[PDB]
Structure 1
């Protein structure tokens, strides 16, 4: 039970530079009082001083809310611009978002910049909302005692934690529900269809298309249901953006904050050497592991040891990749991005490329380098001094079951005093990052899309993992993280593109595997061509079918629209009246 505290600011103050901090402390408090926020300073753990921030008067917040609504209508995410009409009430998500905007936005936008990165607030560590322990307990208990989740649970998640967390949980729920179809015909193929079935690959591609398009429709439906349809158009300035000078684009009077694009491109070009070095190092590691496993297969008991290195490889996956992820972040911090959307998209692209490598390159080597060309691992036995087509199937099994275990291990198993202690322990937790969960789900989807044909049972394992994850991530948000700042998005974002890629490549990969493990380059090229064009045709057909489904968003929009809803002139003086024209026409008929 919180004490009405809306936000908490850390404001670490070390004794080495206390003086510069001390005056800065007052520079904080006044900077809040001018915005109409009541402040509450209290003791902090490890030479810190947490300050609690709440709304001073409800009238100021109502007006702020009204102002926000007006802007949202201006940018087009609202239907009609509405101050005593609150009886659309203010949910906790949007109230917290507006409080964060008041605390964060500069004086130009009616706020007061307390950004903990760019400005003089170098002693402010984190500004975070507090957790509702009763709500978290009820949420966990309700989700852990139900086999399925209706839209009511996702709506509650939206109301409490914002639209980003709600969109992630909706995507996870839809993906888990759609994983039932694939799981069914994967078990069917495993039971009856022998090994490396081509029709299973076709069904997997069809399911990938169907799920991707249906989710693209469902996210639009959800965005319309909430009030966040079109937020992607609203560009948000990044506080960390460093400028060179301020210009004035001759379209508006706004003094834009310019940065030479060529300077940014000169840094973005540093991604190519980084990606090449990462791919070379990981390729060397995977080649070494494959050579060692081939040597341990050739030279002798059980068959579990044959892929023992591969297991270890994935055990090293969350470390190695993690390190790489950090580098990616630094790279994304080196190229300046003036928009939150652009920065997020670039970071997501870099992380997706790195995780794609670290998660799929071993399978790619096993399927398209070792099996077709089984004469390059000669050097393999030569160095280790002291062709099985089921290799890809066993590698897929070990890349399905064991990474699930390692991710579960990483994520799950690893009169005022009580409230103050709770806040103090909350500040040490890490801020929730939904991009990591999105990346994990996208990686699993890619596994299903382009490698489940080797082991069709992978879909069932991923379905069980997704059911467990729908509650594991809820528990992680509830007790293992600070409450995320409630943001607003109309979609899962650039991850959508990733999904499409992982679908398309799947159509080329799966069928190729089917040709390369069931037994001439002509046949392989023909199979790849047929699979890719079948994928494209199915994509067109599914898009056409879903374009004629009459989604609630469209009828809601058209309902709103409906509710809103001399000789040159003597030519006409000859017969000016009414009856004379008819009479003359009748005479003209009689004559001819």
Structure 2
């Protein structure tokens, strides 16, 4: 398969600006060779020069020793790093960390062990992408093995860690845990739909309890995996963004300027929410118009919603592009803060685009449906319709995806690399966002359509292999990054859960018929809070394997790290002391 190539650099050279392009190429070559990297140059499609780079095991051993020293410094590696640059790796050299360290060597600034060739900030305006190569032998075996199973063991996630790093492995572990936890809502939602009719209050409590239990158990599993993979606490390592444009040095950026460009979110968010509300109001007005005076064969009534969801991927993509443009123009020093801000913006936009139609149907039309008269007479109150609407939503994605699916020398290695270079980087945040949106649907609107949980369970089982296929075939190999958790998405999940405990409950009051609505909302929220406290208390006192491992390591370290003068001169010893004590009690 691969010829030992460890990284690939694109370095587009156009027909124009060739004179400085050659200088950039030679400078890149000296910068790469100074670090101690073996390099090769080959053709690429459309005037590109692919550069193949590997490591001299002594230099790599020294670099991994320095990296382990740095990890020990920040507390993410409690055990001793190693003896010396000698053979102490008999601590494996697994491909994920090797590729991450080689990428750091390639892209780190010249100040600290590297030669910065970042393709956006510095004069490296000609390099397009720096990516590792895919292992087809491993990829085909992984795809075949995952498709031949029904449940994935922890060893599969460990192999994903070993090959693609911490972020991809964490996403796959989260998806596996969420899919396994989706069985309970599927089972009891099928039970409620079979027996309890529709809009079951007990179903709302069960869904909220499942949501909080799953959230807390996933936090416990997250810390377990973080201490198992040796990446616990890596979030404290704040790495600077190369594209950070600073002003002075004491690098620093005026916080007031960042606040000023952050305030641009409010007009952007307001414009997006107003446009989306207008679109959804028009769509639902047309829906009630066709459901009022028209003929079907029934199913055609909710067709505007079907069209809205079929068109919503494009609107969501445009909004995500705008959010990314806004995030790029608003400077962030660390990459963690930039990623958190981008995740927050994308989560808000997707929250709007995916839930505002249901929110308008439930808490706007149902309580007072007499506000649609202007639109209704421009073209010219069912309580259960939301259920049907929710059903369409909860099936729209899966069904349309299915529809799409139905519609449908060393020259070979060089051609494979050239084909791979045209692919796009794998963005795990998109998959995280789609899973978070599905969880929000489950915790928010499953009361209307209790069967939604089974459909999402089937979709999750399909996605556990669909995303694997996307990574293996449809995407170039991502850079192995280290993270101790799924990031800020946890917060989003928590938020959804909390507000879910409101919305679903309110639905049960609104679609089954004021002071009663407020009582139901407050009782559901307080039940959610008390079960959150109870589950946190239960899991806190529960013994985790990571805690036992940490305690064993601490015990091993402990095993390895192991007047006044006249008053006091009366009875200077011990014999006189108890002699005088015996006579002393003898006096009484």
The TM-score normalised by the length of structure 1 is 0.97
Equivalent residue runs for 1:23-34 within 5 Å: 23-34=23-34
Q: Secondary structure at the residue paired with 2:420? A: helix
Structure 2 portions without partners, runs of 5+: 558-562
State the shift of 1:137 in Å: 0.3
Q: Distance in 2 between matches of 1:413 and 1:469?
A: 19
State the shift of 1:109 in Å: 1.2
Q: Distance in 1 between matches of 2:462 and 2:160?
A: 18
Q: Distance in 1 between matches of 2:343 and 2:405?
A: 20
Q: Secondary structure at the residue paired with 1:107? A: coil
Q: Write out per-residue CA displacement over residues 460-505 of structure 1, whole angstroms, 9 at most, x where no aligned residue.
A: 0000000000000000000000000000000000000000000000
Q: Distance in 2 between matches of 1:350 and 1:491?
A: 19
Q: Distance in 2 between matches of 1:163 and 1:499?
A: 20
Structure 1 portions without partners, runs of 5+: 248-256
Partner of 2:376: 381
Contact 1:43 1:49 in 2 (8 A): yes
Change (3 A) 1:406 1:244: farther
Partner of 1:66: 65
Q: Write out per-residue CA displacement over residues 155-214 of structure 1, whole angstroms, 9 at most, x where no aligned residue.
A: 000000000000000000000000000000000000000110000000000000000000
Contact 1:163 1:489 in 2 (8 A): yes
Q: Distance in 2 between matches of 1:409 and 1:118?
A: 42
Q: Distance in 1 between matches of 2:142 and 2:191?
A: 36
Change (3 A) 1:411 1:222: farther
Contact 1:101 1:111 in 2 (8 A): yes
State the shift of 1:89 in Å: 1.0
Q: Distance in 2 between matches of 1:35 and 1:489?
A: 26
Q: Write out per-residue CA displacement over residues 315-352 of structure 1, whole angstroms, 9 at most, x where no aligned residue.
A: 11100111010000000011100000000000000000
Contact 1:412 1:476 in 2 (8 A): no
Change (3 A) 1:302 1:505: farther
Q: Secondary structure at the residue paired with 1:49? A: strand
State the shift of 1:409 in Å: 6.2
Contact 1:167 1:491 in 2 (8 A): yes
Q: Write out per-residue CA displacement over residues 9-39 of structure 1, whole angstroms, 9 at most, x where no aligned residue.
A: 0000001111111111001000000000000
State the shift of 1:408 in Å: 5.7
Equivalent residue runs for 1:491-570 within 5 Å: 491-519=485-513, 521-564=514-557, 567-570=563-566
Contact 2:79 2:553 in 1 (8 A): no
Q: Distance in 1 between matches of 2:493 and 2:476?
A: 29
State the shift of 1:404 in Å: 2.3
Q: Distance in 2 between matches of 1:99 and 1:75?
A: 20
Q: Distance in 1 between matches of 2:10 and 2:118?
A: 12
Contact 2:165 2:480 in 1 (8 A): yes
> In the alignment, is residue 312 of structure 1 matched against residue 288 of structure 2?
no
> In the alignment, is residue 364 of structure 1 matched against residue 364 of structure 2?
no
Q: Secondary structure at the residue paired with 2:8? A: strand
State the shift of 1:411 in Å: 8.9
CA RMSD of aligned residues (A): 1.0
Q: Secondary structure at the residue paired with 2:54? A: strand
Count residues with an aligned counterpart. 578
State the shift of 1:85 in Å: 1.0
Q: Distance in 2 between matches of 1:151 and 1:415?
A: 41
Contact 1:412 1:472 in 2 (8 A): no
Q: Distance in 1 between matches of 2:388 and 2:301?
A: 10
State the shift of 1:265 in Å: 0.2
> In the alignment, is residue 574 of structure 1 matched against residue 567 of structure 2?
no
Of 409-418 and 304-313, more deviation after overlay is shown by: 409-418
Of 149-158 and 412-421, more deviation after overlay is shown by: 412-421
Q: Distance in 1 between matches of 2:584 and 2:37?
A: 87
Q: Write out per-residue CA displacement over residues 438-471 of structure 1, whole angstroms, 9 at most, x where no aligned residue.
A: 0000000000001000000000000000000000
Q: Distance in 1 between matches of 2:214 and 2:439?
A: 11
Change (3 A) 1:408 1:20: farther
State the shift of 1:563 in Å: 0.5
Q: Distance in 1 between matches of 2:331 and 2:225?
A: 33
State the shift of 1:410 in Å: 7.0
User: Of residues 205, 223, 234 in structure 1, which corresponds to 2:237?
Assistant: 234
Q: Distance in 1 between matches of 2:409 and 2:47?
A: 23
Partner of 2:560: none
Q: Secondary structure at the residue paired with 1:34? A: helix
The TM-score normalised by the length of structure 2 is 0.97
Q: Distance in 2 between matches of 1:472 and 1:545?
A: 36
Q: Write out per-residue CA displacement over residues 523-546 of structure 1, whole angstroms, 9 at most, x where no aligned residue.
A: 000000000000000000000000
Q: Write out per-residue CA displacement over residues 539-582 of structure 1, whole angstroms, 9 at most, x where no aligned residue.
A: 00000000011101111111100011xx2211110010110000
Contact 2:262 2:330 in 1 (8 A): yes
Q: Secondary structure at the residue paired with 1:24? A: helix
State the shift of 1:81 in Å: 2.5
